[PDB]
């Protein structure tokens, strides 16, 4: 198809450009498509890119517009006062502003389809909304339109929503172009997707990204594949992984490192209205917060994540119970059988389900996948699916059988409703993952487990020592292994907080010397120091020059291999903002070789101070570039729940940072 109108090189400098005589007479029929390539690295709070209005006195609410906010939200308005119609559709965090100090060219595609009565918006290849209405308003059937405008909406003779920016190109079609056609429009994206809606995870949402560079040169990533919107556990969440063999240019189709099957892998468009957005999957088991390390000695890749039984998250996780019974030095997983009100069973050697009350074994065994067998026969439960068909969240049996697992709601034998940690290993650098195994309790039998710090474990350069950071109330608890993750010991380091989400990431400043950076409740990122390979830990200090909110955000951190200005370098990834999760930065720190203090010398803006930046992952790619995988939105904001494809990957070089 061909355009009815096309223009470009429009500078939007707080002054509207009139294009009425060019466009209005060309509009015909009830379906239209807009394609607009535009930049805005210093937008006003609220600004219209494009407008069709009745500019006459007494019709200030008769217009169509495509507008954006300085938060990076995109939307349209479709209004006609005679018709009684006031459509307003939008999605937060749809835009890029700057990248490597250069305004990004956004590609916007808006489709107004009268046949299907749907309004659809894409930005940079990604569908951001699609709204069906009972009563369709085509964008030029608005009563009395007489202006077509760029960089404002002409209301009653005046410029409303003045835009700052530029439109390199704008095209208009008297047709609703097809989805397949939309995907043929070329893009200028500064980012890539590794995990996306519609891939092999069938999750519509993703949180909690990780990156780690393996010795073979392959770069691995893990992530929460979140099914029930972007909600933390309780929910359905699996841990998925992908890898790149070409320095981050291409990424393998994701597989699962940890997954439960009590609930279907449904790709669900989660409600974003205030009435329904807190809908949360309540009967599913899940995984959350993964962390990756590589073991030199074995060559194994090791991944840990939190494991939640059906309906459990960090708020209802049975505190005061580890879920294991200690029997003369040995920890055994406890089980409750349906019909008993207490936990009478333990899983002993070879998965034998042993009755602690009668002190006899039963005919039941637990296998390697934590599945229940009776006399060697595999038991099953029926799977659940979720839907919103009835106007509220419904979780129901879908007709198919899956292996009965002790983490499931329907299981004959059930684990303690608390938080667990599990590890899986890969022998082929992420091509496949072993069945996970739970880690033993570290803080005693009558105490609920810690929570894993998402991101990277630490492989000490000059030994076989492996360290994963985890947190609980009042301390970081480091998990330490010197035998390839076969056995773990804990090392406790006290922090001056109660009940924090103390997400910690580590770097080795030099051999045996670990600095850990962690999230606090103070508005500042903290750090502590070990000088004996994590055996003991210094008191807590704080970084000046970076701000977080009172609730904080995960921070990622690496030891960079090459000197910068002749010094050893550390790199931190974090929002820099006291207001929200926005203002993303990579911060470059040079180590004082004399005292291990760190000079935070360069702050690189990922995008606009007002555009969202949340949890993140950094790794030095083999070519010495920097790989960044991050939540490109405010993942705390209750206004920005359940956005698709906002976890993005970019490639930077040190020269870009400085
Ligand atoms: O700060 S955020 O709310 O965006 C993420 C915190 N996630 C913490 C957490 C970790 C483990 C479980 Cl089971 C539940 C919640």
CATH for 125: 2.60.120.200
Which CATH number does the domain housing residue 404 bear?
A: 2.40.220.10
Among protein residues, the one with the nearest Cα to ligand 1's atom 10 is 314
- Tally of structural domains, the chain: 3
348 and 234, same domain (yes or no): no
Domain boundary among 394, 417, 440: 417
Q: Are residues 364 and 478 in the same domain?
A: no
Ligand 1 atom closest to Cα of residue 552: 1
615 shares its domain with 492:
yes
Catalytic residue among 332, 615, 633, 649, which?
A: 615
CATH number of residue 546's parent domain: 2.120.10.10
Atom of ligand 1 nearest to the CA of 551: 1
| CB contact at 8 A, 41 and 98 | yes
Does residue 373 sit in the same domain as residue 388? yes
Phi/psi of residue 105, nearest 5 degrees: -85, 110
| Whether the Cβ atoms of residue 313 and residue 292 lie closer than 8 Å to each other | no
Instruction: Indicate the helix (H) or strand (E) that contains 191.
Output: none
* Mutational test site, ligand 1, from 232, 306, 554, 643, max ligand atoms within 8 Å of CB: 232
Residues 195, 90 within the same domain: no
Are 253 and 419 contacting, i.e. CB atoms less than 8 angstroms apart?
no
**Distance in Å, CA 234 to ligand 1 centroid:** 10
Q: Please check if 429 is assigned to a binding site.
A: no
Same domain? For 76 and 148 the reply is yes
Residue 162 is inside which H or E element, if any?
none
**Which tokens hold the place of 208?**
């909690």
Are 174 and 261 in the same domain? no
Contact indicator for 313, 241 with CB cutoff of 8 Å: no
Residue 589 near residue 49 (C-beta atoms within 8 A)? no
Which H helix or E strand runs over 324?
A: strand 324-327
Q: What is the resolution of this structure in A?
A: 2.3
Least Cα distance to 308 among 347, 348, 278, 280 occurs for 280
CA distance linking residue 310 with residue 395, whole number of Å: 12
Residue 111 CA to ligand 1 centre (angstroms): 37
Using CB distances shorter than 6 Å, the residues near ligand 1 are 232-233, 288-289, 306, 308, 313-314, 419, 451, 501, 635-636
| Residue 615 and residue 504 share a domain | yes
Enter the tokens of residue 337: 């059988």
Question: What range does the domain containing 527 cover?
Answer: 191-319+418-658
Distance 232 CA to ligand 1 centre (A): 5
Q: Which two tokens stand for residue 544?
A: 């000046």
> Which residue(s) pair with 581 in the sheet?
none
CA 489 to ligand 1 centroid distance, Å: 24
Question: Do 66 and 211 lie in a common domain?
Answer: no
Ligand 1 atom with the shortest distance to the CA of 636: 4
- Of 392, 417, 442, the position where a domain reaches its end is 417
Catalytic pick among 105, 232, 262, 264: 232
**Same-domain pairing of 503 and 513:** yes
Q: First-to-last CA distance in the chain?
A: 46
| DSSP codes joined into one string, 217-281 | S-EEEEEEEESSTTPPSSS-EEEEEEEESSTTS--PPPEEEE---SB---------STTTTT---
């Amino acid at each position: 198809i061909s355009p009815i109108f096309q223009g470009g090189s429009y500078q939007l400098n707080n002054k509207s450009i009139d294009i009425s005589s060019l466009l209005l007479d060309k509009l015909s029929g009830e379906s239209q498509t807009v394609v607009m390539k535009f930049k805005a690295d210093k937008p006003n709070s609220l600004q219209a890119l494009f407008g069709l209005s009745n500019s006459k006195a007494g019709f200030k609410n008769n217009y169509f517009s495509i507008f954006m906010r300085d938060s990076g939200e995109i939307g349209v308005e479709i209004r006609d006062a005679q018709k009684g119609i006031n459509y307003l559709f939008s999605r937060p965090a749809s835009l890029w502003g700057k990248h490597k100090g250069q305004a990004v060219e956004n590609t916007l595609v808006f489709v107004s389809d009268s046949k299907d009565k749907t309004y659809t918006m894409y930005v940079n290849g990604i569908e951001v909304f699609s709204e069906t209405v009972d009563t369709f308003l085509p964008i030029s059937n608005i009563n009395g339109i007489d202006k077509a405008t760029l960089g404002a909406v002409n209301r009653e003779g005046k410029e409303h929503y003045l835009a700052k920016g530029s439109i390199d190109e704008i095209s208009l079609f008297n047709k609703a172009i097809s989805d397949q056609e939309v995907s043929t429009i070329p893009l200028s994206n500064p980012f890539q997707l590794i995990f996306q809606s519609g891939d092999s995870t069938q999750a519509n949402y993703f949180r909690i990204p990780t990156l780690y560079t393996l010795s073979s040169g392959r770069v691995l990533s893990s992530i929460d594949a979140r099914y029930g919107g972007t909600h933390d556990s309780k929910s359905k969440i699996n841990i998925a992984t992908s890898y790149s063999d070409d320095n981050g240019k291409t990424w393998s189709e994701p597989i699962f490192a940890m997954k439960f099957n009590d609930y279907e892998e449904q790709l669900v468009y989660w409600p974003r209205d205030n009435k329904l957005k807190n809908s949360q999957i309540s009967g599913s088991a899940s995984f959350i917060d993964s962390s990756i390390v590589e073991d030199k000695k074995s060559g194994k890749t090791i991944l840990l994540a939190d494991v939640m039984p059906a309906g459990i998250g960090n708020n209802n996780a049975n505190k005061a119970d580890s879920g294991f019974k200690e029997i003369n030095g040995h920890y055994y997983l406890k089980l409750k059988k349906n019909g008993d009100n207490d936990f009478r069973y333990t899983v002993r050697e070879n998965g034998v389900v042993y009755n602690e009350t009668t002190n006899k074994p039963t005919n039941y065994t637990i296998n390697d996948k934590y599945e229940v067998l009776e006399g060697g026969k595999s038991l099953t439960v029926e799977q659940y699916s979720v839907d919103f068909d009835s106007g509220s969240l419904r979780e129901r049996h879908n007709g198919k059988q899956v292996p009965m697992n002790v983490f499931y709601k329907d299981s004959l034998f059930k684990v303690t409703p608390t938080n667990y940690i599990a590890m899986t290993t890969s022998q082929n650098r992420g091509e496949s993952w072993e069945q996970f195994k739970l880690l033993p309790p570290f803080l005693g039998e009558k105490h609920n487990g810690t929570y894993l710090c998402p991101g990277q474990g630490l492989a000490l350069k000059s030994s076989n020592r492996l360290i994963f950071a985890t947190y609980t109330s009042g301390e970081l608890t480091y998990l330490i292994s010197d035998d390839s993750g076969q056995t773990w010991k804990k090392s406790s380091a006290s922090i001056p907080f109660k009940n924090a989400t103390a997400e910690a990431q580590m770097v080795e400043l030099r051999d045996g010397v670990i600095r850990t950076f962690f999230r606090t409740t103070t508005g500042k990122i903290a750090y502590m120091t070990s000088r004996d390979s994590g055996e003991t830990w210094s008191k807590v200090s704080y970084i000046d020059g970076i701000q977080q909110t009172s609730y904080g955000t995960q921070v990622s951190a690496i030891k960079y291999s090459q000197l910068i200005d002749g010094k050893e370098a550390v790199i931190l990834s974090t929002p820099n903002s006291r207001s929200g999760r926005k203002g993303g930065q990579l911060v470059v720190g040079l180590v004082n070789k004399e005292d291990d203090s760190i000079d935070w010398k360069y702050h690189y803006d990922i995008d606009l101070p007002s555009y969202g930046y949340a949890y993140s992952a950094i790794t030095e790619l083999p070519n010495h570039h920097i790989g960044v995988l991050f939540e490109k939105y405010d993942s705390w904001s209750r206004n920005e729940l359940h956005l698709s494809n906002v976890v993005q990957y970019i490639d930077l070089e040190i020269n870009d940072l400085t």
